[PDB]
């Protein structure tokens, strides 16, 4: 094993604070931020990827192991000079000095570089977790420059915990949360007060009730209206929260995650439901978010919640109404083929919460649709839909219909609970409106289409899909295991006397007994066996088999299948042309791998025998799963 020298090429620059969710007269503000750069030339702006966009408005992640080397090669690009400071900032030796000027000061365009051995002084212990949290910031004006925006996260971990892939991922997934009430009586804000807001209409509210940050900025970062973007994780892959509070002396932030419970190491580990974040207390805390859906982080201190802390997060997965991974799924998955175009393009980047100005789907086309391929047959319980924000303009989809496909070939429309002809969905009201439409129940698709019925200024959408897995279903549905009850299967008829009862309940793949299968009362090709599923299912295929009656051999050679949603009237199974002549059995044992070209959407599944051997006789199984459960 080795040690590593890990240099971070980092600078300070401005831009700042977009509001643009929904809730036009938005101000510009112009505070400072830390920024990662590529090298010593300081050119490439090191594009903040989907995996750390939550980080947004503060600095990048500086990271090391125990016996390691940390290096910062820093440039300042701003008006006030700033600096780089943290707890282990091991400055060495003495000098031919005048009472030790150990003052860190970094002038604009000058390059102050410093590097140090990270000793076990910063390190987590055996009683602790994989990695500890620390803060870096600017020490020049440590009152102002924390409100100025120079907040930074530092991660010190155990040896053999990081990767060649950068950072660590061994069942991890890490997010820093940065709780501060910001204020502009601090950093340079004179160059904001009469820069923007004022020209000839000015001279309104000096310091008297104008309090521009106590008008707004309760930060969980600085994307902090009631919403910040990239809090994206799996419901099993057990997440580490890096919770640091900063700011002034009221900046006690009592934070929780509704529906979830976390575990905090200290001496031993003990289990907590909310944490009181104190200014200068840098916490590391873990959870296993086994409640799938959509939640939020909030500071539960009354007044702080009611001015910008009700901030979302999203947990994808299995168990089993989970997101399908519009954040953490596929970097640029499926989209359209023609129906989607504005430069700022289609899915590609139409994901729920995704930040920036180039963000979401965007078409001024009356005949529009988007289309995801879920790569597999999948459960989809619902959809969260949301709009995007323009120049000064609110723009979303207000109504939509959904279509889906199981194959790629034959699509149809959708129909909510007894609704009418077509299921009309309500969309957003605004450019934020996380309108979590559940599909009451089902859709086993692979492909989903969203078509707008009405729009604002364009057909504009970003979204996330709910559901899970089936069970990835070349798996038995429950005829062998008997998850499908003996009450839950009827046939057209059954053969019964005294020595035998060949009831429909017995049509199971490997059954023994005297009457060990289904047989009808007489032998017709308009006969049938019917599985009721007490909820709506997907079918991969039907595995058929015959009977060893001790008398003679008995099996079904050829058959047809019918489906139904109501349970009473029947739409039957077709090829590309006429009905499907299914190839079946030849013996008293041996099961048949008999699957469907379109996989079947159905709650009611009927076997219709055609040709047989000696009598019609059936043992069987269904391969499949649900998706959801009715209409």
Cβ–Cβ < 8 Å for 225, 308 = yes
DSSP structural state of residue 522: S
Cβ–Cβ < 8 Å for 192, 16 = no
Full DSSP string of 287-306:
E---S-S-EEEEE-SHHHHT
Cβ–Cβ < 8 Å for 517, 618 = yes
Cβ–Cβ < 8 Å for 77, 109 = yes
DSSP structural state of residue 504: G
DSSP structural state of residue 540: E
Tokens coding 40: 């010593």
List, in order, residues 6 or more apart from 429 with CB less than 8 Å away. Answer: 22, 396, 398, 435
Neighbours of 490 (CB within 10 A): 15
In which residue ranges of the chain is CATH 2.60.120.260 found?
332-468, 489-626
DSSP structural state of residue 362: -
Burial of residue 592 (number of CB atoms within 10 Å: 0-12, 13-18, 19+): buried
List, in order, residues 6 or more apart from 68 with CB less than 8 Å away. Answer: 3, 4, 5, 6, 117, 118
In which residue ranges of the chain is CATH 2.60.40.420 found?
5-316
DSSP structural state of residue 363: B
Sign of CA dihedral 32, 36, 42, 46: negative
Cβ–Cβ < 8 Å for 68, 122 = no
Q: Kind and range of the H or E element at 145?
A: helix 144-147
CA distances from 193 to 20, 28, 202 (A): 21, 10, 10
Cβ–Cβ < 8 Å for 150, 13 = no
Q: Which CATH superfamily is domain 332-468 in?
A: Galactose-binding domain-like (2.60.120.260)
- Considering the segment(s) 5-316 as one domain, its CATH architecture is Sandwich (2.60)
Full DSSP string of 38-64:
SSSS--S-----GGG-TTTTS---EEE
Cβ–Cβ < 8 Å for 481, 442 = no
Nearest to 188 by CA among 39, 81, 98: 81
How far apart are alpha carbons 397 and 449 in whole angstroms? 14
- Name the maximum alpha-carbon separation found in the chain: 112
Beta strands in 40-193 (DSSP E): 62-64, 69-76, 111-117, 131-136, 152-157, 174-181
Q: Kind and range of the H or E element at 190?
A: helix 190-193
Resolution in Å equals 15.0
Which 3 state secondary structure label does DSSP give 117? strand
How far apart are alpha carbons 174 and 233 in whole angstroms? 9
For 259-296, letters b (16+ CB in 10 Å) and e give: ebebeebeeeeeeeeebebebeebbbbbbebebbbebb
Torsion (CA) 524, 526, 529, 534 in degrees, nearest 10: -160
Tokens coding 25: 């007269």
C-alpha angle 289/440/442, rounded to 5°? 90
Which 3 state secondary structure label does DSSP give 485? coil
How far apart are alpha carbons 171 and 233 in whole angstroms? 11
How far apart are alpha carbons 71 and 158 in whole angstroms? 18
Which 3 state secondary structure label does DSSP give 134? strand
Cβ–Cβ < 8 Å for 123, 101 = no
Cβ–Cβ < 8 Å for 445, 404 = yes
Nearest to 114 by CA among 163, 164, 62, 151: 62
Residue 277 CA, distance from chain mean position: 26
Torsion (CA) 197, 198, 202, 203 in degrees, nearest 10: 90
Residue 252 CA, distance from chain mean position: 30
Nearest to 406 by CA among 287, 273, 532, 539: 539
Nearest to 582 by CA among 605, 601, 608, 563: 608
Tokens coding 286: 């873990």
Neighbours of 103 (CB within 10 A): 8
Tokens coding 83: 């600096």
Sign of CA dihedral 343, 348, 352, 354: negative
Residue 603, Ramachandran bin (φ over 0: left; ψ between -120 and 50: alpha; else beta): alpha
Q: Does the domain made of 489-626 have the CATH classification 2.60.120.260? A: yes
> 303 phi and psi, to 5 degrees?
-60, -40
User: Looking at the chain, how many residues does it have?
Assistant: 631
């Amino acid at each position: 094993f080795q040690k590593k020298t890990r240099h971070y090429f980092i600078a300070a620059v401005e831009r700042l604070w977009d509001y643009g969710m929904s809730s036009g007269s938005v101000p510009q503000f112009k505070k400072v931020v830390f920024q990662e750069f590529t090298d010593g030339s300081f050119t490439q702006p090191l594009y903040r990827g989907e995996l750390n966009e939550h980080l947004g408005l503060l600095g990048p992640y500086i990271r090391a192991e125990v016996e390691d080397n940390i290096m910062v090669t820093f440039r300042n690009q701003a008006s006030r000079p700033y600096s780089f400071y943290s707890s282990l900032i091991s400055y060495e030796e003495d000098q031919r000095q005048g009472a030790e000027p150990r003052k860190n000061f970094v002038k604009p365009n000058e390059t102050k570089t410093y590097f140090w051995k990270v000793q076990h002084h910063m390190a987590p212990t055996k009683d602790e977790f994989d990695c500890k949290a620390w803060a870096y910031f600017s020490d020049v004006d440590l009152e102002k420059d924390v409100h100025s925006g120079l907040i930074g996260p530092l991660l010190v971990c155990h040896t053999n915990t990081l990767n060649p892939a950068h950072g660590r991922q061994v069942t991890v997934q890490e997010f820093a949360l940065f709780l501060t009430i910001f204020d502009e009586t601090k950093s340079w804000y004179f160059t904001e007060n009469m820069e923007r807001n004022c020209r000839a209409p000015c001279n309104i509210q000096m310091e008297d009730p104008t309090f521009k940050e106590n008008y707004r900025f309760h930060a969980i970062n600085g994307y902090i209206m009631d919403t910040l973007p990239g809090l994206v994780m799996a419901q099993d892959q057990r997440i580490r929260w890096y919770l640091l509070s900063m700011g002034s002396n009221e900046n006690i932030h009592s934070i929780h995650f509704s529906g979830h419970v976390f575990t905090v190491r200290k001496k031993e580990e003990y289990k907590m439901a909310l944490y009181n974040l104190y200014p200068g207390v840098f916490e590391t805390v873990e959870m296993l978010p086994s409640k799938a859906g959509i939640w939020r982080v909030e500071c539960l201190i009354g007044e702080h919640l009611h001015a910008g802390m009700s901030t979302l997060f999203l947990v994808y997965s299995n168990k089993c109404q989970t997101p399908l991974g519009m954040a953490s799924g596929h970097i640029r998955d499926f989209q359209i083929t023609a129906s989607g175009q504005y430069g700022q393009w289609a899915p590609k980047l139409a994901r729920l919460h995704y930040s920036g100005s180039i963000n979401a789907w965007s078409t001024k086309e009356p005949f529009s649709w988007i289309k995801v391929d879920l790569l597999a047959p999948m459960i989809i319980h619902g959809i969260k839909t949301q709009g995007a924000r323009q120049k000064f303009s609110s723009l979303y989809i207000s109504q939509f219909i959904i279509m889906y496909s199981l194959d790629g070939k034959k699509w149809q429309t959708y129909r909510g609970n007894s609704t009418g002809t077509l299921m009309v969905f309500f969309g957003n009201v605004d450019s934020s409106g996380i309108k979590h439409n559940i599909f009451n129940p089902p859709i086993i698709a692979r492909y989903i289409r969203l078509h707008p019925t009405h729009y604002s200024i364009r057909s504009t959408l970003r979204m996330e899909l709910m559901g899970c897995d089936l069970n990835s279903c070349s798996m038995p549905l429950g005829m062998e295991s008997k998850a499908i009850s003996d009450a839950q299967i009827t046939a057209s008829s059954y053969f019964t006397n005294m020595f035998a009862t060949w009831s429909p309940s017995k049509a199971r793949l490997h059954l023994q007994g005297r009457s060990n299968a289904w047989r009808p009362q007489v032998n017709n090709p308009k006969e049938w066996l019917q599985v009721d599923f007490q909820k709506t299912m997907k079918v991969t295929g039907v595995t058929t088999q015959g009977v060893k009656s001790l008398l003679t051999s008995m099996y079904v050679k050829e058959f047809l299948i019918s489906s139904s949603q109501d349970g009473h009237q029947w739409t039957l199974f077709f090829q590309n042309g006429k009905v499907k002549v299914f190839q079946g059995n030849q013996d008293s044992f041996t099961p048949v791998v008999n699957s469907l070209d379109p996989p079947l959407l159905t709650r009611y599944l009927r076997i219709h025998p055609q040709s047989w051997v000696h009598q019609i006789a059936l043992r069987m199984e269904v391969l499949g799963c649900e998706a959801q459960d009715l209409y």
